[PDB]
């Protein structure tokens, strides 16, 4: 384990804790949201379940194919008190979580790890196709 | 908000904790098993994720609906070394999830509550059926 | 036939009025919602038709069985003069549905009827399910 | 408001009494038929119930359309006591319907509605096919 | 194992061997029905195999997971000379397999074992279904 | 080519120009609508695209079939500066679709041409159907 | 009834009493099969009861055909203390099944009986299968 | 061409022949097969059809690859003037569909050819199940 | 029986033996039609064989319903001597069939039969539709 | 918005004009393509339209995302003679939209906007597919 | 082993060898085949490679069975330089493949091997089936 | 052709040869694999066959496309005594499938070929799953 190895894994774990973190949100969004937009925005968060699920079980694998320690500690989730702060949050949430993915591209790009920097580049495509949806609802 | 509606909900928020918890173990579980069987046990705990997601829903749903705040902080998850350790683990934690619904129940039949009695006796066989299976495969 | 049974039989002729009474309001309820939301409000009405005629079909099946005759007479349908109308007279609805079943299930439980307080058990537990949805569209 | 649209939303509304009436019709045979054919009969009239939703659904559609109220109020089922009776009594069920929309289809036609009169040329046709079936059955 | 486990084990047994026994005569059923109706009963029959097998299932693994051994000897089947014989038969089957799933329900009740209670139920709601169905056949 | 042959590809070219328009409108809709009913709309705009595509491509091959040259050449799209516009300008084309196509029906009919009045019928009928919906979405 | 015909019929009342007696087997192993490899084994014994139900289905309708009465009574299983035993007590029943059907084959080809011949090699067919696949299992 | 490729030509011109014959039978008996069993028979009799279909294709294919020129000209159908009746003649026309394959097979085999006697070895055995229906309806 | 009604029936009856023709045509086309295109036209054939199949049934159950005596007689098929005959041959096919409706239309109309008018409108789109695919694959 | 984000947008407009222009050639070519190869061209050219539906619904949301107006209007589309013009005309147009998208890459890389370049090397790999498919049909 | 079985088992491998080469032989012609047909053909070279696959896996399995050791290299493939050759060389491959397994027949069946001799006349049956094709390709 | 288009087809036809390799191997491996986790690692084996299979195809294209010569000429299969040495072999023609992708994909991107890297990087990404799979099921 190289300094650097050491620190991609460290990273993986913070965005595997806040891929737990968003598996909790969006469940919880599900769950609470209410009016007659709760019809339209309950699937919506649904689905982003499904396909952060996909990430944290491909980040754990990840973490321990490099011969680290998976985490099961997820991030905090901002409590929302209303709709408009459910996405807002939700927003926010996909804009650290490609923040932080675009940080582990350049640690994957930098050790020259072909396959993890084609699944990091997907997964900000992807996550940022959520964002700019958020944003449009929002908007 | 009776005390018993108070206690009730403090039950329910417990149960969905634990809940975000067996999410968060089975995801782990299904990344990090090894060896030949992995083939055989991924899916199985893949299948678990879907299953305990729907009981997140639903209970998070029942504590709004009930007055209370869903909470979004999961149980701690046990460290598993093996997979003898990791389906021991699991069996354990559905162990203490049907303690709780078998107690949640009785509050819940004590409030005459018909529908969420009818949802409690559902998710304890539903819990029951996976705590046999890991039995079966743990002897 | 028994008094007990007798009443227990105009008792599931009353659900079953009510039932046919809440297949006409769904499909009304679909027919004529207006708005935007009106995308979102004809799929769930329609839902609820399908749900309501299989309750209307154990019900009809189940008098004929106990010696009964079947009524094809529906309860009345509120007018709703608006969608805010639409959703609590659909919830007011429900709400008279389930309180009819939960005495039809202690008629049932005092004449020993398993199988029958199995699915007025289940009958409730769904009823619940759609009355609860309308609070959190209403609310 | 002219008053041909009057005399025409009257007559819709006549259709509208009456497909009601075909769903609960359907949904009572569907119930109650007895004996060996029962296994044959039931599916036969359960199918004939989701069409018959489809044309509630139109014509309340189109009733509001036309600045009409669509009517909640079922016409009378007639009481059948026995399996030759039920299909008789659909039988003639469907003849009334028919002859009902070939006069709402003159009525169309008189006000240049042509999406109006392709959709009641349909919904003879689609009557007749099931009158028509009817007859075979009872012949 | 208690006294009360030996003599639930023994009624698990008991139920079991019925339900090979109805797989068994289903199969025959369906194999040797004849007439016009045979093109209707066949399937009906059919039907039948999968849901007795998959209670067949239940209680076998039940049995072992209660620490008792799974019976392999069926039931005897009773001979049907006829199609009538054939249906009264099977209800009569299904009326003791009632009959006997009312007492483990009263028995595993009192050992306060509240996934096999509602097993139990359930499996009584459907062989209920199954029963009153060749009733209406029957009458 | 009579005269009314040509008369009659010049109607089949506008429409089939009013075609292609639609398609890029719809795609432009999906594409560029917002706020929280965008979930809602989205699919809305979405399903019209494949409807309208499978007239572009009967209307070409009518063209075709009939010694015209199909145009590829499609109407303007009207630019939209809110939803309430989109929903309007969604409307508007569709109400000046079907006028086109009572004419063309006149014109097929007129020429004795039972499939194309067939088909501009059915059509008639499709589009009537989307601007009513429209006219719910927008009253 | 000839002679020849009476010894055929004797033989394939062997063979549907050995058929029930594997299903019978087949869902017991499915039940009872316990250790990781249950999660691989239940499914293989599971697909082998559907594949032994239409070989009984078949043999009872020929028996029938052929002027003989079905019987409904099994072979006896064999009881497997653990899996070898288990999957070794299974391949034997296949082999002594498929020993029976080439008998019965050299029975049918003598009597000229094409249809039962053609089905006779092919249940061969697919028994060695199943045998060929335990032996792989099994070593 | 041989004087028995000739003769197995002829041969199978009869039989295609015959095939195209039962196919027009089978479409004939579902339009007007009458009585509460025609919603029996009409599924049983349209299943026919595809099967004839396939050997009607299969038969054709064989002809022209072996150099002959495949009949368009079918056999009669014998005239049904009821349900008993058409059973019956239906039963007839396989009896003699088989009785010919049989002896196409024995020109097949006589000729050394593999692939054209396993497959009318199989069309043999998928016709002698339809009758062996047939004679279960009729007895 | 009118004389209209009659000569209707014969007109049925034309239509009938027409479509039994156009059946073994395209399965004699799909089994002979040779060259790589083979793989191209094969499927279209097979798939008019449907089609035909749909109208055949149709056109003998009405004949039956107006009381005549639905045909089993086909016409005769045209040989084809190449694949440019083959589509030319079914081309003409479906011409005198689609004159022959347009006959039976203004029959069907004259005696005001709606249901039967709106079936032979739409029998001449589709085998329109057909022709003009033919045309496209001829030119 | 920088200048280098004004001319990323007039880049995307460029495109999604071309996108639109696509479409519409494909529907025009899928309705208009003759000869029996039209049966193996109009699905592929039908395929095509889906793949630039994709295309262009991706283009204005990001257009619309980047704070930029969507065009409505699509570049023109060559006619096309005869089928080697159709199928060189859609292959210019693909390599035309390469040439843009590899212009639009180094854009979006200088820009550093992640999601855009993994998205436009996708739509180039996929539009490259196209092109080399139409290659192999030309030669 | 005896000298029979050695050479029985020499003869699967060679057809094994044959097996693998027509696999790597159909992908090769999918990827290569060039011009208009290439829409044609490329799915029908496709649909031969799982066909071979299947017979590929029972003839390793079959020799693994027999004692043998299954060899893992091909037969040479012919270059062919354009797509006549293609189809011819496909058509001579089959050939050969069945003439192996005619001989393959006539070891098995001298042998007794009653499972093994009708999966041989099955790909027999099927491979003259690809070779029947081919040949309708070809002239 | 350059020398590095020539040498990067040298490259692809390395590639391609790799791939029937594999394509070979995971057959062999899918037939052969013994013991009780065959029922887990055969479907395994399998699923890798379809992948490998899309990568010939794509390589056998390029290679065309280029203007080379696509090589059938496997790479050969190293024995494997046991299941140990199956997965390890496995695991190391996997390694060395992506040290030369790895390779191509520097020759690609060396060439501008934007479409070749992207599928290359894809390749990698799909083959490094394969491999890091094999690890957790080796280690």
Same mark, same amino acid.
Do not use: C, W
């Given at each position: 384990?190289?300094?650097?190895?050491?620190?991609?894994?460290?990273?993986?774990? *913070?965005?595997?804790?806040?891929?737990?973190?968003?598996?909790?949100?969006?469940?919880?969004?599900?769950?609470?949201?209410?009016?007659?937009?709760? !019809?339209?925005?309950?699937?919506?968060? *649904?689905?982003?379940?499904?396909?952060? !699920?996909?990430?944290?079980?491909?980040?754990?694998?990840?973490?321990?194919?490099?011969?680290?320690?998976?985490?099961?500690?997820?991030?905090?989730?901002?409590?929302?008190?209303?709709?408009?702060?459910?996405?807002?949050?939700?927003?926010?949430?996909?804009?650290?979580?490609?923040?932080?993915?675009?940080?582990?591209?350049? !640690?994957?790009?930098?050790?020259?790890?072909?396959?993890?920097?084609?699944?990091? *580049?997907?997964?900000?495509?992807?996550?940022?196709?959520?964002? *700019?949806?958020?944003?449009?609802?929002?908007?």
């Amino acid at each position: 384990m190289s300094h650097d190895v050491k620190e991609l894994i460290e990273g993986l774990n *913070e965005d595997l804790a806040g891929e737990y973190s968003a598996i909790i949100m969006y469940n919880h969004n599900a769950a609470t949201v209410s009016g007659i937009y709760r !019809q339209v925005l309950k699937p919506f968060f *649904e689905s982003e379940i499904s396909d952060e !699920q996909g990430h944290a079980l491909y980040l754990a694998e990840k973490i321990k194919t490099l011969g680290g320690t998976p985490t099961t500690i997820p991030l905090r989730v901002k409590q929302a008190e209303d709709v408009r702060e459910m996405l807002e949050y939700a927003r926010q949430s996909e804009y650290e979580t490609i923040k932080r993915y675009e940080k582990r591209k350049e !640690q994957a790009a930098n050790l020259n790890m072909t396959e993890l920097v084609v699944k990091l *580049e997907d997964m900000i495509a992807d996550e940022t196709n959520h964002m *700019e949806e958020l944003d449009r609802l929002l908007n």
